[PDB]
Short mmCIF file of all heavy atoms in Angstrom, two decimals:
data_model
loop_
_atom_site.label_atom_id
_atom_site.label_comp_id
_atom_site.label_asym_id
_atom_site.label_seq_id
_atom_site.Cartn_x
_atom_site.Cartn_y
_atom_site.Cartn_z
N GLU S 1 0.78 -1.25 0.00
CA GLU S 1 0.00 0.00 0.00
C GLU S 1 0.83 1.32 0.00
O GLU S 1 1.55 1.58 0.97
CB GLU S 1 -1.04 0.04 1.14
CG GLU S 1 -1.54 1.46 1.40
CD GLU S 1 -3.06 1.61 1.57
OE1 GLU S 1 -3.82 0.73 1.10
OE2 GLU S 1 -3.48 2.64 2.17
N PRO S 2 0.68 2.16 -1.08
CA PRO S 2 1.40 3.49 -1.21
C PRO S 2 0.77 4.60 -0.33
O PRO S 2 -0.40 4.44 0.10
CB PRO S 2 1.27 3.81 -2.71
CG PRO S 2 0.12 2.92 -3.24
CD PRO S 2 -0.29 1.92 -2.18
N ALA S 3 1.51 5.68 -0.04
CA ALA S 3 1.00 6.83 0.75
C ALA S 3 0.08 7.75 -0.06
O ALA S 3 -0.89 8.35 0.46
CB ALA S 3 2.15 7.65 1.34
N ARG S 4 0.44 7.91 -1.34
CA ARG S 4 -0.32 8.70 -2.30
C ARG S 4 -0.53 7.87 -3.58
O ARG S 4 0.35 7.10 -4.00
CB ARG S 4 0.42 10.01 -2.66
CG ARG S 4 0.62 11.07 -1.53
CD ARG S 4 1.00 12.44 -2.10
NE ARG S 4 -0.18 13.31 -2.24
CZ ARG S 4 -0.88 13.85 -1.21
NH1 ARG S 4 -0.52 13.62 0.06
NH2 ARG S 4 -1.94 14.64 -1.42
N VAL S 5 -1.72 8.03 -4.19
CA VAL S 5 -1.95 7.54 -5.58
C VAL S 5 -2.47 8.70 -6.43
O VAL S 5 -3.01 9.72 -5.91
CB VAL S 5 -2.94 6.34 -5.60
CG1 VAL S 5 -2.45 5.24 -4.66
CG2 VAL S 5 -4.38 6.80 -5.19
N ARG S 6 -2.32 8.56 -7.74
CA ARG S 6 -2.90 9.50 -8.67
C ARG S 6 -3.92 8.74 -9.52
O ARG S 6 -3.58 7.67 -10.06
CB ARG S 6 -1.79 10.07 -9.54
CG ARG S 6 -2.37 11.06 -10.57
CD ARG S 6 -1.25 11.67 -11.44
NE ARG S 6 -1.82 12.78 -12.24
CZ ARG S 6 -1.10 13.55 -13.06
NH1 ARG S 6 0.21 13.33 -13.18
NH2 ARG S 6 -1.69 14.51 -13.75
N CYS S 7 -5.16 9.25 -9.61
CA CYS S 7 -6.22 8.57 -10.40
C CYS S 7 -6.94 9.54 -11.33
O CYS S 7 -6.94 10.76 -11.08
CB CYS S 7 -7.29 7.91 -9.50
SG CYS S 7 -6.58 6.56 -8.52
N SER S 8 -7.52 8.99 -12.40
CA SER S 8 -8.49 9.68 -13.18
C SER S 8 -9.76 8.85 -13.07
O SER S 8 -9.69 7.65 -12.67
CB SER S 8 -8.11 9.69 -14.64
OG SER S 8 -6.86 10.26 -14.88
N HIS S 9 -10.89 9.43 -13.45
CA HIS S 9 -12.11 8.67 -13.38
C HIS S 9 -13.10 9.21 -14.36
O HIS S 9 -12.95 10.36 -14.94
CB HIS S 9 -12.68 8.70 -11.92
CG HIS S 9 -13.38 9.96 -11.55
ND1 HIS S 9 -14.62 9.95 -10.96
CD2 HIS S 9 -13.06 11.27 -11.76
CE1 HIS S 9 -15.03 11.19 -10.79
NE2 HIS S 9 -14.10 12.01 -11.26
N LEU S 10 -14.13 8.41 -14.58
CA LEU S 10 -15.26 8.80 -15.41
C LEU S 10 -16.50 8.60 -14.50
O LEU S 10 -16.71 7.51 -14.03
CB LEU S 10 -15.37 7.84 -16.60
CG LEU S 10 -16.38 8.19 -17.73
CD1 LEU S 10 -16.06 7.45 -19.12
CD2 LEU S 10 -17.84 7.95 -17.40
N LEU S 11 -17.34 9.61 -14.33
CA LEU S 11 -18.46 9.56 -13.38
C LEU S 11 -19.69 9.57 -14.21
O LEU S 11 -19.79 10.37 -15.14
CB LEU S 11 -18.44 10.78 -12.41
CG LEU S 11 -19.73 11.06 -11.56
CD1 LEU S 11 -20.08 9.92 -10.62
CD2 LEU S 11 -19.49 12.35 -10.78
N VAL S 12 -20.63 8.67 -13.91
CA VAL S 12 -21.93 8.80 -14.55
C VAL S 12 -22.88 9.02 -13.37
O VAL S 12 -23.00 8.16 -12.50
CB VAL S 12 -22.36 7.58 -15.33
CG1 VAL S 12 -23.82 7.72 -15.95
CG2 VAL S 12 -21.36 7.35 -16.50
N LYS S 13 -23.56 10.15 -13.36
CA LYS S 13 -24.48 10.52 -12.26
C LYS S 13 -25.85 9.96 -12.56
O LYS S 13 -26.11 9.58 -13.68
CB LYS S 13 -24.52 12.06 -12.23
CG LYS S 13 -23.27 12.64 -11.49
CD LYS S 13 -23.55 14.10 -11.00
CE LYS S 13 -22.29 14.73 -10.42
NZ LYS S 13 -22.58 16.14 -10.16
N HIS S 14 -26.75 9.94 -11.58
CA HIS S 14 -28.08 9.47 -11.81
C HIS S 14 -29.02 10.28 -10.89
O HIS S 14 -28.55 11.10 -10.09
CB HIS S 14 -28.20 7.96 -11.51
CG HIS S 14 -27.61 7.58 -10.19
ND1 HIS S 14 -28.20 7.88 -8.99
CD2 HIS S 14 -26.46 6.93 -9.88
CE1 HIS S 14 -27.46 7.44 -8.00
NE2 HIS S 14 -26.39 6.86 -8.52
N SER S 15 -30.33 10.04 -11.03
CA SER S 15 -31.30 10.85 -10.26
C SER S 15 -31.11 10.86 -8.73
O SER S 15 -31.48 11.85 -8.07
CB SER S 15 -32.74 10.52 -10.68
OG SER S 15 -33.03 9.23 -10.26
N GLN S 16 -30.50 9.83 -8.17
CA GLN S 16 -30.18 9.82 -6.72
C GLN S 16 -28.78 10.26 -6.30
O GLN S 16 -28.41 10.12 -5.10
CB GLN S 16 -30.41 8.44 -6.11
CG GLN S 16 -31.85 8.06 -5.94
CD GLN S 16 -31.97 6.71 -5.13
OE1 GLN S 16 -31.68 6.65 -3.88
NE2 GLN S 16 -32.31 5.62 -5.87
N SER S 17 -27.97 10.70 -7.25
CA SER S 17 -26.70 11.35 -6.89
C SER S 17 -26.98 12.56 -5.94
O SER S 17 -27.97 13.26 -6.09
CB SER S 17 -25.93 11.81 -8.16
OG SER S 17 -25.72 10.74 -9.11
N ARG S 18 -26.05 12.79 -5.02
CA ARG S 18 -26.02 13.94 -4.09
C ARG S 18 -26.24 15.23 -4.81
O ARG S 18 -26.92 16.12 -4.27
CB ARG S 18 -24.71 14.02 -3.35
CG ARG S 18 -24.84 14.61 -1.94
CD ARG S 18 -23.57 15.39 -1.55
NE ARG S 18 -22.68 14.69 -0.59
CZ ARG S 18 -21.65 13.89 -0.93
NH1 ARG S 18 -21.34 13.65 -2.21
NH2 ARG S 18 -20.92 13.31 0.04
N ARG S 19 -25.70 15.36 -6.03
CA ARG S 19 -25.92 16.57 -6.85
C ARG S 19 -26.29 16.16 -8.29
O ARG S 19 -25.40 15.93 -9.11
CB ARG S 19 -24.65 17.42 -6.78
CG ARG S 19 -24.86 18.88 -6.99
CD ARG S 19 -23.53 19.66 -6.84
NE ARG S 19 -22.67 19.60 -8.03
CZ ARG S 19 -22.99 20.08 -9.24
NH1 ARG S 19 -24.17 20.66 -9.45
NH2 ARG S 19 -22.14 19.97 -10.26
N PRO S 20 -27.60 16.03 -8.60
CA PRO S 20 -28.06 15.50 -9.88
C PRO S 20 -28.01 16.52 -11.02
O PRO S 20 -29.00 16.76 -11.71
CB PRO S 20 -29.51 15.02 -9.59
CG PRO S 20 -29.97 15.84 -8.48
CD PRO S 20 -28.73 16.28 -7.67
N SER S 21 -26.79 16.98 -11.29
CA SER S 21 -26.55 18.11 -12.17
C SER S 21 -25.10 18.01 -12.60
O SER S 21 -24.26 17.59 -11.78
CB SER S 21 -26.68 19.35 -11.30
OG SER S 21 -26.58 20.52 -12.09
N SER S 22 -24.77 18.37 -13.84
CA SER S 22 -23.35 18.46 -14.22
C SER S 22 -23.15 19.38 -15.39
O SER S 22 -24.14 19.87 -15.93
CB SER S 22 -22.85 17.09 -14.62
OG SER S 22 -23.36 16.76 -15.91
N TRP S 23 -21.89 19.61 -15.80
CA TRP S 23 -21.60 20.49 -16.92
C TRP S 23 -22.27 19.94 -18.18
O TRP S 23 -22.52 20.68 -19.09
CB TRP S 23 -20.07 20.66 -17.15
CG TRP S 23 -19.38 19.33 -17.56
CD1 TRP S 23 -18.80 18.40 -16.71
CD2 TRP S 23 -19.20 18.82 -18.91
NE1 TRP S 23 -18.33 17.31 -17.48
CE2 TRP S 23 -18.55 17.55 -18.81
CE3 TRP S 23 -19.56 19.31 -20.19
CZ2 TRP S 23 -18.24 16.75 -19.95
CZ3 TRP S 23 -19.26 18.50 -21.34
CH2 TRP S 23 -18.58 17.23 -21.20
N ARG S 24 -22.59 18.65 -18.24
CA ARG S 24 -23.14 18.06 -19.48
C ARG S 24 -24.63 18.23 -19.51
O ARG S 24 -25.21 18.19 -20.60
CB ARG S 24 -22.94 16.51 -19.61
CG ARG S 24 -21.55 15.98 -19.35
CD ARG S 24 -21.40 14.50 -19.71
NE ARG S 24 -21.75 14.30 -21.11
CZ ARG S 24 -22.66 13.44 -21.57
NH1 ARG S 24 -23.31 12.61 -20.76
NH2 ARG S 24 -22.93 13.41 -22.87
N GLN S 25 -25.28 18.33 -18.33
CA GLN S 25 -26.73 18.18 -18.31
C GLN S 25 -27.18 18.82 -17.03
O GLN S 25 -26.75 18.40 -15.96
CB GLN S 25 -27.11 16.72 -18.31
CG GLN S 25 -28.60 16.39 -18.47
CD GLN S 25 -28.77 14.88 -18.68
OE1 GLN S 25 -28.13 14.06 -18.00
NE2 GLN S 25 -29.62 14.50 -19.62
N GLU S 26 -27.97 19.88 -17.16
CA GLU S 26 -28.46 20.64 -16.00
C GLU S 26 -29.25 19.84 -14.95
O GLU S 26 -29.10 20.06 -13.73
CB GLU S 26 -29.29 21.86 -16.42
CG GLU S 26 -29.45 22.90 -15.24
CD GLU S 26 -29.93 24.28 -15.74
OE1 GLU S 26 -30.35 24.29 -16.91
OE2 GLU S 26 -29.87 25.30 -14.97
N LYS S 27 -30.13 18.98 -15.43
CA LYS S 27 -30.97 18.19 -14.53
C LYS S 27 -30.65 16.80 -15.01
O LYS S 27 -31.00 16.42 -16.12
CB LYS S 27 -32.46 18.48 -14.79
CG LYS S 27 -33.45 17.72 -13.87
CD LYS S 27 -34.94 17.79 -14.42
CE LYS S 27 -35.93 17.17 -13.38
NZ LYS S 27 -35.42 17.29 -11.94
N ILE S 28 -29.99 16.05 -14.17
CA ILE S 28 -29.75 14.65 -14.53
C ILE S 28 -30.93 13.80 -14.04
O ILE S 28 -31.19 13.75 -12.84
CB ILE S 28 -28.41 14.14 -13.96
CG1 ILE S 28 -27.30 14.88 -14.74
CG2 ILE S 28 -28.34 12.55 -14.05
CD1 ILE S 28 -26.01 14.81 -14.19
N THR S 29 -31.59 13.11 -14.96
CA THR S 29 -32.74 12.30 -14.62
C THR S 29 -32.61 10.76 -14.76
O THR S 29 -33.60 10.01 -14.45
CB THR S 29 -33.93 12.70 -15.53
OG1 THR S 29 -33.51 12.53 -16.88
CG2 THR S 29 -34.32 14.15 -15.32
N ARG S 30 -31.48 10.28 -15.32
CA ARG S 30 -31.36 8.83 -15.60
C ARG S 30 -31.46 8.07 -14.29
O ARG S 30 -31.14 8.59 -13.22
CB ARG S 30 -30.07 8.51 -16.36
CG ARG S 30 -28.77 8.86 -15.57
CD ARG S 30 -27.54 8.35 -16.38
NE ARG S 30 -27.23 9.20 -17.54
CZ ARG S 30 -26.41 10.27 -17.48
NH1 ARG S 30 -25.79 10.58 -16.31
NH2 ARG S 30 -26.16 10.98 -18.57
N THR S 31 -31.98 6.85 -14.36
CA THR S 31 -31.99 6.01 -13.17
C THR S 31 -30.57 5.50 -12.82
O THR S 31 -29.68 5.48 -13.65
CB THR S 31 -32.99 4.86 -13.33
OG1 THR S 31 -32.51 3.91 -14.31
CG2 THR S 31 -34.37 5.44 -13.82
N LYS S 32 -30.38 5.12 -11.59
CA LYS S 32 -29.22 4.31 -11.20
C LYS S 32 -28.94 3.10 -12.15
O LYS S 32 -27.80 2.86 -12.60
CB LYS S 32 -29.38 3.88 -9.74
CG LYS S 32 -28.09 3.28 -9.15
CD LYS S 32 -28.33 2.70 -7.71
CE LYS S 32 -28.29 3.77 -6.64
NZ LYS S 32 -28.71 3.17 -5.36
N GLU S 33 -30.00 2.36 -12.48
CA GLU S 33 -29.85 1.24 -13.39
C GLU S 33 -29.29 1.69 -14.75
O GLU S 33 -28.42 1.04 -15.31
CB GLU S 33 -31.22 0.57 -13.60
CG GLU S 33 -31.23 -0.54 -14.64
CD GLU S 33 -32.59 -1.27 -14.73
OE1 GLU S 33 -33.60 -0.82 -14.12
OE2 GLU S 33 -32.64 -2.31 -15.42
N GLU S 34 -29.85 2.77 -15.30
CA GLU S 34 -29.45 3.31 -16.62
C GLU S 34 -28.01 3.86 -16.59
O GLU S 34 -27.28 3.76 -17.58
CB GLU S 34 -30.36 4.46 -17.04
CG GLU S 34 -31.64 4.08 -17.74
CD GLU S 34 -32.74 5.18 -17.64
OE1 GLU S 34 -32.60 6.27 -17.00
OE2 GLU S 34 -33.80 4.89 -18.16
N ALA S 35 -27.65 4.50 -15.50
CA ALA S 35 -26.24 4.94 -15.27
C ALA S 35 -25.31 3.69 -15.28
O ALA S 35 -24.20 3.73 -15.88
CB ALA S 35 -26.12 5.67 -13.89
N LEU S 36 -25.73 2.62 -14.58
CA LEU S 36 -24.88 1.41 -14.56
C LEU S 36 -24.72 0.85 -15.96
O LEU S 36 -23.62 0.40 -16.36
CB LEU S 36 -25.37 0.33 -13.61
CG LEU S 36 -24.51 -0.95 -13.52
CD1 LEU S 36 -23.09 -0.61 -12.98
CD2 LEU S 36 -25.15 -1.98 -12.61
N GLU S 37 -25.79 0.88 -16.73
CA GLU S 37 -25.68 0.40 -18.09
C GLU S 37 -24.76 1.26 -18.97
O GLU S 37 -23.99 0.69 -19.83
CB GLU S 37 -27.05 0.09 -18.76
CG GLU S 37 -28.13 -0.66 -17.85
CD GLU S 37 -27.60 -1.62 -16.72
OE1 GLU S 37 -26.56 -2.30 -16.89
OE2 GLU S 37 -28.27 -1.73 -15.65
N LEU S 38 -24.73 2.57 -18.75
CA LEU S 38 -23.79 3.40 -19.47
C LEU S 38 -22.38 3.09 -19.08
O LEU S 38 -21.47 2.98 -19.96
CB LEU S 38 -24.03 4.88 -19.17
CG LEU S 38 -25.28 5.42 -19.98
CD1 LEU S 38 -25.81 6.76 -19.37
CD2 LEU S 38 -24.92 5.60 -21.47
N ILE S 39 -22.15 3.00 -17.78
CA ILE S 39 -20.87 2.62 -17.23
C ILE S 39 -20.37 1.29 -17.82
O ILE S 39 -19.25 1.20 -18.24
CB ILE S 39 -20.91 2.55 -15.67
CG1 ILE S 39 -20.88 3.94 -15.06
CG2 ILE S 39 -19.79 1.73 -15.13
CD1 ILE S 39 -19.55 4.61 -15.12
N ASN S 40 -21.22 0.28 -17.83
CA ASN S 40 -20.85 -1.02 -18.42
C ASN S 40 -20.47 -0.91 -19.91
O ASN S 40 -19.50 -1.51 -20.29
CB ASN S 40 -21.98 -2.01 -18.22
CG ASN S 40 -22.15 -2.44 -16.75
OD1 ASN S 40 -21.22 -2.39 -15.90
ND2 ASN S 40 -23.32 -2.98 -16.48
N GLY S 41 -21.19 -0.11 -20.70
CA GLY S 41 -20.87 0.10 -22.13
C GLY S 41 -19.48 0.76 -22.23
O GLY S 41 -18.66 0.38 -23.12
N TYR S 42 -19.17 1.73 -21.33
CA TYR S 42 -17.86 2.41 -21.42
C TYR S 42 -16.72 1.45 -21.10
O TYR S 42 -15.67 1.47 -21.76
CB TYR S 42 -17.76 3.64 -20.49
CG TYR S 42 -18.77 4.74 -20.85
CD1 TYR S 42 -19.32 5.54 -19.85
CD2 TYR S 42 -19.16 4.96 -22.18
CE1 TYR S 42 -20.21 6.53 -20.13
CE2 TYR S 42 -20.08 5.94 -22.49
CZ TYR S 42 -20.60 6.72 -21.44
OH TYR S 42 -21.50 7.69 -21.67
N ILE S 43 -16.91 0.66 -20.03
CA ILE S 43 -15.90 -0.36 -19.63
C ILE S 43 -15.65 -1.30 -20.81
O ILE S 43 -14.47 -1.63 -21.12
CB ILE S 43 -16.39 -1.12 -18.36
CG1 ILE S 43 -16.21 -0.23 -17.11
CG2 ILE S 43 -15.57 -2.38 -18.08
CD1 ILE S 43 -16.99 -0.78 -15.89
N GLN S 44 -16.74 -1.73 -21.49
CA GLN S 44 -16.58 -2.62 -22.64
C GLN S 44 -15.73 -2.01 -23.76
O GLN S 44 -14.83 -2.71 -24.31
CB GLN S 44 -17.89 -3.08 -23.19
CG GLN S 44 -18.63 -4.04 -22.27
CD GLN S 44 -19.95 -4.51 -22.91
OE1 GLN S 44 -20.82 -3.69 -23.22
NE2 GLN S 44 -20.06 -5.81 -23.16
N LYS S 45 -16.00 -0.76 -24.10
CA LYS S 45 -15.23 -0.10 -25.11
C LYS S 45 -13.80 0.15 -24.73
O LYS S 45 -12.89 0.13 -25.58
CB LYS S 45 -15.85 1.24 -25.49
CG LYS S 45 -17.22 1.02 -26.09
CD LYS S 45 -17.71 2.29 -26.75
CE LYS S 45 -18.77 1.95 -27.83
NZ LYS S 45 -20.13 1.78 -27.17
N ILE S 46 -13.58 0.45 -23.47
CA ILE S 46 -12.22 0.70 -23.03
C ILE S 46 -11.47 -0.64 -23.09
O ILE S 46 -10.32 -0.73 -23.60
CB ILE S 46 -12.19 1.25 -21.62
CG1 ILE S 46 -12.72 2.70 -21.60
CG2 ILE S 46 -10.74 1.15 -21.03
CD1 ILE S 46 -13.21 3.22 -20.20
N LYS S 47 -12.09 -1.69 -22.56
CA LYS S 47 -11.41 -3.00 -22.56
C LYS S 47 -11.22 -3.64 -23.95
O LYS S 47 -10.24 -4.39 -24.14
CB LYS S 47 -12.13 -4.02 -21.65
CG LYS S 47 -11.95 -3.75 -20.13
CD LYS S 47 -12.58 -4.91 -19.40
CE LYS S 47 -11.96 -5.00 -18.09
NZ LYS S 47 -12.28 -6.29 -17.40
#
């Protein structure tokens, strides 16, 4: 285990996020399930 790590990330928000808003979309309305499906599609393309 290191003292510091450096990470990047990709966040997909959904209607129950603490802040359902982002630079891409003023009111984020997608469900948690739909966010997971987007996330899974991105992982597939990256892999």
Side-chain angles (χ1 to χ4, degrees):
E1 163 135 338
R4 295 196 97 69
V5 307
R6 179 179 190 178
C7 295
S8 302
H9 78 131
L10 189 160
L11 166 62
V12 177
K13 280 201 187 172
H14 49 73
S15 68
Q16 287 188 70
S17 306
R18 211 212 256 92
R19 206 177 80 63
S21 185
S22 75
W23 64 268
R24 312 189 57 235
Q25 188 171 43
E26 197 164 13
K27 181 194 187 28
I28 291 166
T29 57
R30 62 174 76 89
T31 70
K32 192 187 278 172
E33 175 175 9
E34 275 158 358
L36 181 63
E37 318 330 325
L38 283 163
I39 283 286
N40 289 337
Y42 297 147
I43 284 166
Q44 291 181 301
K45 297 193 157 83
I46 289 160
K47 288 186 156 193

